[PDB]
Design a protein around this motif. Sequence first.
Motif, mmCIF file in Angstrom:
data_model
loop_
_atom_site.group_PDB
_atom_site.id
_atom_site.type_symbol
_atom_site.label_atom_id
_atom_site.label_comp_id
_atom_site.label_asym_id
_atom_site.label_seq_id
_atom_site.Cartn_x
_atom_site.Cartn_y
_atom_site.Cartn_z
ATOM 1 N N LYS B 191 -63.139 6.270 -59.199
ATOM 2 C CA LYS B 191 -62.084 5.777 -58.271
ATOM 3 C C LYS B 191 -61.442 6.959 -57.531
ATOM 4 N N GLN B 199 -62.517 1.497 -54.533
ATOM 5 C CA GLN B 199 -61.714 1.414 -55.782
ATOM 6 C C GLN B 199 -61.655 -0.046 -56.239
ATOM 7 N N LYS B 200 -61.469 -0.971 -55.296
ATOM 8 C CA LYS B 200 -61.410 -2.434 -55.552
ATOM 9 C C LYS B 200 -62.724 -2.862 -56.222
ATOM 10 N N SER B 203 -63.055 -1.669 -59.770
ATOM 11 C CA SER B 203 -62.162 -2.531 -60.589
ATOM 12 C C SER B 203 -62.925 -3.798 -60.987
ATOM 13 N N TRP B 206 -65.751 -3.053 -63.470
ATOM 14 C CA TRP B 206 -65.210 -2.850 -64.841
ATOM 15 C C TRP B 206 -64.992 -4.206 -65.522
#
Lengths: 273, 270, 268, 269, 269
Positions: B191, B199-200, B203, B206
């Motif tokens: 990130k 980054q989204k 997320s 993950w």
Amino acid sequence: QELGNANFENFIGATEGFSEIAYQFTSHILTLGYAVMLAGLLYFILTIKNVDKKFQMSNILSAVVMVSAFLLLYAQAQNWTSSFTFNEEVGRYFLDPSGDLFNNGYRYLAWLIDVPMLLFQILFVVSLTTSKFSSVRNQFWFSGAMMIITGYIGQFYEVSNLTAFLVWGAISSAFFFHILWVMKKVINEGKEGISPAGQKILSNIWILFLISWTLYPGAYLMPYLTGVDGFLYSEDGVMARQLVYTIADVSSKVIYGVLLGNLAITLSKNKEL
Amino acid sequence: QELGNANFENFIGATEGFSEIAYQFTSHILTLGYAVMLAGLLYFILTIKNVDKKFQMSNILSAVVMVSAFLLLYAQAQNWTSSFTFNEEVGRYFLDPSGDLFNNGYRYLAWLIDVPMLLFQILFVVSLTTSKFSSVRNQFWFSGAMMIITGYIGQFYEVSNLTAFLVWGAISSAFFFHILWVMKKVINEGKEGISPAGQKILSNIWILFLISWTLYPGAYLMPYLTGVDGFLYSEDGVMARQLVYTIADVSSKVIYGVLLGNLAITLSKN
Amino acid sequence: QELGNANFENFIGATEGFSEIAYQFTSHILTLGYAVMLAGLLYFILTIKNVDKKFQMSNILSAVVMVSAFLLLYAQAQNWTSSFTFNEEVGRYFLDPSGDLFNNGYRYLAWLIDVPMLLFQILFVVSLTTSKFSSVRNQFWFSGAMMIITGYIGQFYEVSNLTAFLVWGAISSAFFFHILWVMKKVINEGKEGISPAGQKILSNIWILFLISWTLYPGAYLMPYLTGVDGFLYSEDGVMARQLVYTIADVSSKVIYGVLLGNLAITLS
Amino acid sequence: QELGNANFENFIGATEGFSEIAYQFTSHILTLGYAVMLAGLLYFILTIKNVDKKFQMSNILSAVVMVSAFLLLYAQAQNWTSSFTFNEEVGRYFLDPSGDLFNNGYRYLAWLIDVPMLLFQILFVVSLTTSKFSSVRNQFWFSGAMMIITGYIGQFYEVSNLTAFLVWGAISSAFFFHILWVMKKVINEGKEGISPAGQKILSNIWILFLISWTLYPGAYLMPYLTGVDGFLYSEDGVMARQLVYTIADVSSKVIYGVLLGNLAITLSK
Amino acid sequence: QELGNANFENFIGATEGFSEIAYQFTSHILTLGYAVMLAGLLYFILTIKNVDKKFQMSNILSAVVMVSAFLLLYAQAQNWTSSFTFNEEVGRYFLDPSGDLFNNGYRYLAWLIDVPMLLFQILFVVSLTTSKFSSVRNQFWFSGAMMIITGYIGQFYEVSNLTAFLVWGAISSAFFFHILWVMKKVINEGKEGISPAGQKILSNIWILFLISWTLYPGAYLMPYLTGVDGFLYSEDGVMARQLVYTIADVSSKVIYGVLLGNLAITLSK
Ligand SMILES: *C/C=C(C)/C=C/C=C(C)/C=C/C1=C(C)CCCC1(C)C
Ligand SMILES: *C/C=C(C)/C=C/C=C(C)/C=C/C1=C(C)CCCC1(C)C
Ligand SMILES: *C/C=C(C)/C=C/C=C(C)/C=C/C1=C(C)CCCC1(C)C
Ligand SMILES: *C/C=C(C)/C=C/C=C(C)/C=C/C1=C(C)CCCC1(C)C
Ligand SMILES: *C/C=C(C)/C=C/C=C(C)/C=C/C1=C(C)CCCC1(C)C
Ligand SMILES: CCCCCCCC/C=C\CCCCCCCC(=O)O
Ligand SMILES: CCCCCCCC/C=C\CCCCCCCC(=O)O
Ligand SMILES: CCCCCCCCCCCCCCCCCCCC
Ligand SMILES: CCCCCCCCO[C@@H]1O[C@H](CO)[C@@H](O)[C@H](O)[C@H]1O
Ligand SMILES: CCCCCCCCO[C@@H]1O[C@H](CO)[C@@H](O)[C@H](O)[C@H]1O
Ligand SMILES: CCCCCCCCO[C@@H]1O[C@H](CO)[C@@H](O)[C@H](O)[C@H]1O
Ligand SMILES: CCCCCCCCO[C@@H]1O[C@H](CO)[C@@H](O)[C@H](O)[C@H]1O
Ligand SMILES: CCCCCCCCO[C@@H]1O[C@H](CO)[C@@H](O)[C@H](O)[C@H]1O
Ligand code: NA
Ligand code: NA
Ligand code: NA
Ligand code: NA
Ligand code: NA
């Protein structure tokens, strides 16, 4: 029961039979085997253009070996499940002659493709110094063929004639030692004039080559590595043999080909990965 | 009937047998499984050139996983239809030992390809900061191998020896927790220094990773998730297990690989 | 005999059996089915670079659907020939339970790939105006999944429980109507701001979509379209069902994908 | 021995049975069949870039036909070996109903792909003069479909109902004659405004088309080409039929596609 | 047992049966066979761009031959394991007629692809001087077809009728000698105007061609090469035949195609 010059898997399968774990694992490890090879085939094709044109033949030869290994490991996986059938009364898998006797000989004749190509392909990445290309290739191919053919003959007698088994195995080992000797030279000369990074990879290739190739004679002797009526002359030995073959195959073919590809990248003028 | 160290599907198939729905659905969900993987293989190959050269290894590794998953899910689909045969008298599918006992172990040894490659491929899209590439890779591969091998051993005893089943399962879980821990670090470092869009996606990767990977131990325990002689220790549990595996496989391999590809696109200068 | 929650093909096969024509044609039409899909796969791959980069995802998704359809139609072709075996005495093909009962459920779960991808791929060719990309995609995927899952459950009861069959079928139809509604919006917005040639193709795509997709519920009800003990509750109905599926599959997947490819070319 | 509306191969296999040569040859010729098609598939893909972009669709359609033909000829090869099993006592291969009755119908429904694509693909190499592209395509496709469907129905009755067999065959022939008529026009217009070399190739394409396509109705009638209880109503006729199909298939699909590719090369800048 | 016009493998399998080694080796050598061809297919496709555009058709035709050889050698490998089944009592593999009789005829009809393409492809690497391309091609194809078809007929009689076997074999040999004659001319003209390195390769191609192609008639006669009731009229002869075929196939197709590719590289700018 009369099995003649058959592999020891058939004698274990015909007398004691195979537990669920022994039968299932042997099937699973062979399946993983051919799965790895077809995955490797895709990898080697898709990474061809990651190295300079001059090195791409090594990717192509890796691919060639993957096709051979896949077809043979797939066939051998089917031969395993055909040759041993569940007995409801005792709850074990016994020899099913209708599926043919199981024979590792399939692998050996396949090596007639694999060995020559694996030995050949490094000569498309590394530059020889003192050794002549044609000379090394001819030594590899002749000793490769003889190693396989003598071993192929020997393994038919691994139960029926322990003497023939060991003599042919011994003769095969001689040719193997010659191949190790020549590949050592090729590695050394390959290191000369290339970056330390490339030299490190060749050092790894040699260790990989030495261990992975030595596993094959290990698999050959597997049933008798614990001596007469030993722990290994059993379903545990059958499992061990096919596991060792699978580790050897993945190591000698796929990991080998990946390391050569990585060497090719370091030796490439445009690429720096 | 003497089945030894066999999966619970064989005990259900040998005693109660499988209804048309239970047998057909298990066959259909496994077929969908391998269909998705071969479709995914084509997708990942055809989209290689949609990202910058440096990211294309991730597409290649996705493809590698698709080949593995397809072959195994195909084999497992055939093993299902071979292991259970229709009985005309009672109108249910019973264990047909001539086709071999059904074993999920095929899947496990396949994971020896999938897990290492799925964990490895993210390291070709994201940039690490504090963690060393070689270190993360080695931790993933070691704990990946140990997780699979210990679970593989355990699942043979899922009926014959509940103790061995749970101990091996527990040991496997430890290695799983380690993998989750390392993948968390990789996501966080990934990130750092990338656009909010990237980054989204990480997320989402993950959340996907966490849920999809947790389904596997769920599938492992499935028969006993409703306790001894529970609702799930039945054909309904057999259906549930293969459904969960299929959802997990599609999520952990295909959707995962698509998200990584989308991340690679956002990180691409083109 | 006891067949339980089995498709009507098994009841016809178990009682009347199948004539040479009924058995052979069903096998031939399923074979044509998977042949078309593998041919389509090659077509869609080989024509990728005929459109601008931005549209090529549609070719790729067409290919993805071809792989799915091929694998499933191939499997279903094998299931047909395994499930029904010739009886020498009467000269008809009867249920062979050793090959498993025949179930159309294979196709349904396959649709879990096909439907979402077919609905999704048009959003890579046309530009939405008022509707949000993510919103349309989510509606397509959710209603697509629910339509298939509910229909999948229903078809198991097409003989054993006519009530469950019709209820699940009804619920499935609701989700279908929603998909038709959303695809209509997508077509309308897609037409806005493009050449007459592109508008013509979208008009054709909508007609194709409407007819081809409606054939599936038709195939669902096929055995009872001529009512109780009707002409269609027979081998003729079995033939009809697999014919309609095959026409639907070729239309909804291949022809659809070709028209989208042609639209992509005009927009390039 | 009730076989119903079954192909004559099943009646020969059920009564006389098949000699080693008859059974083996039929198996070999079908195997060659699908081998040629998969080889053709590779050829047509690998030679795509040998012609100008505008002609490459013809290569693609050739490939499409190869996939169809391969799959069908492969399936039909397996159906042959499944339907006839060796009897040790008499040393001949007899009908094995457990493998299903043998039916040529597989081929016919496959033609629903092959015929429309083979007819279509020439319109991507030659330029029409008088005729409209869309018009020719629609005529080919409609008459192609009707020819196949009517023939498909007919061949089920080739033993059970000789009348239905000949009537449906006749109707099919009408649509075939229409296709020949239209393809003739296409060849003539195609020759207009191209080099003599290109005209020569189209002349060859027309001869190939005419002979290769006429073999199919020949295969249809094969069992009765020597009349009732004739030499051909036997294993020799069974061999002949599958040989004719295989010659026809290789000629109509592969050789056809190669000639079109060669025409495309001459027309390429 | 009544086998009729069947290959000698079936007579050995039906009477003495096959030892573990004889059955396993035959299966292994056939498996190696098709493995080599599919590996070769990949090699020839992946090396297309290693030579100038004008030579690439040779790579394509090599690929075409690999597809044919793979499919046929794979089918023949399966036919072997289907035709011979283990007997527990005596511990040998005997004829299993349920799997069909074993026949080498599969290979022969496959050659209808291989021979014409192998002969054709050299004409895309070497330049003829005095001989016309079309003329050489037509001679190769005609004599190739006739050689195969006559040999194909002959091998059905290799046990049932030794006379028919030898006559058809003789006629086949005549066409073979013609092919050798024409290929010699092609090699000679090919050597004219090229580097010594290219001439060396063509010299090797000619030796390879001569030995590898001669192995086929050797495989044909194999059972009788040690005369009536000889050492070779046995499982040892069965092993020998399939070994010779496999050596011949690898040599005539793969090694041949590699040497042509290497020639193409030397002739490339
Ligand atoms: C992928 C295939 C490879 C690398 C094959 C390697 C084979 C060997 C190193 C075989 C060695 C043998 C001996 C040294 C003695 C016994 C017989 C052999 C052939 C197994
Ligand atoms: C596509 C393949 C994947 C992502 C495989 C994942 C496998 C696991 C996360 C397995 C976990 C297990 C445990 C935590 C305990 C029981 C045994 C396992 C291996 C199923
Ligand atoms: C290529 C696959 C496609 C386009 C699948 C489409 C499926 C449907 C439109 C299904 C509709 C159904 C109903 C409306 C009611 C009965 C159950 C279904 C799922 C068959
Ligand atoms: C590769 C497939 C091709 C070219 C198929 C061609 C088919 C025909 C020309 C069929 C013609 C027929 C008749 C004229 C009468 C009898 C029925 C048919 C369909 C065999
Ligand atoms: C890869 C296939 C090749 C090169 C096939 C070659 C075939 C021959 C040279 C056959 C020769 C024969 C004779 C000269 C006499 C007996 C019959 C034949 C066909 C085996
Ligand atoms: C159990 C072994 C599993 C291995 C899977 C085999 C299939 C894929 C093969 C190799 C993929 C590994 C990728 C290595 C990348 C090297 C880094 C680089 O290329 O720069
Ligand atoms: C109970 C099971 C016992 C055996 C399990 C051991 C398995 C170990 C497997 C994989 C180890 C891989 C970790 C290190 C690899 C790094 C290699 C590299 O640097 O490329
Ligand atoms: C460049 C030359 C152009 C010729 C194109 C013709 C296409 C050839 C098709 C493949 C080979 C056909 C002949 C094969 C040999 C004879 C086999 C027929 C036996 C009945
Ligand atoms: C280098 C390895 C050689 C070791 C020699 C091992 C001797 C094995 O000896 C054999 O063992 C078999 C099962 O164990 C027995 O059935 C045989 O009777 C016995 O001869
Ligand atoms: C969440 C993991 C712990 C669950 C443990 C549940 C214990 C199940 O207990 C087992 O159930 C079987 C089937 O019902 C019985 O046949 C066994 O006899 C019984 O030991
Ligand atoms: C299309 C939705 C209308 C469905 C109503 C049709 C009612 C059919 O009714 C059913 O018909 C079967 C076939 O003959 C019979 O076997 C059953 O006994 C009968 O319940
Ligand atoms: C070219 C058009 C063919 C003319 C029709 C041929 C008439 C054949 O007639 C049929 O021949 C069969 C062959 O044995 C017999 O079994 C049938 O009894 C007979 O009706
Ligand atoms: C030119 C090639 C040599 C041909 C020699 C033919 C002589 C073979 O003679 C044959 O041998 C068979 C094998 O035992 C026997 O079964 C036959 O009875 C016998 O006629
Ligand atoms: Na088994
Ligand atoms: Na089953
Ligand atoms: Na059947
Ligand atoms: Na047969
Ligand atoms: Na066998």
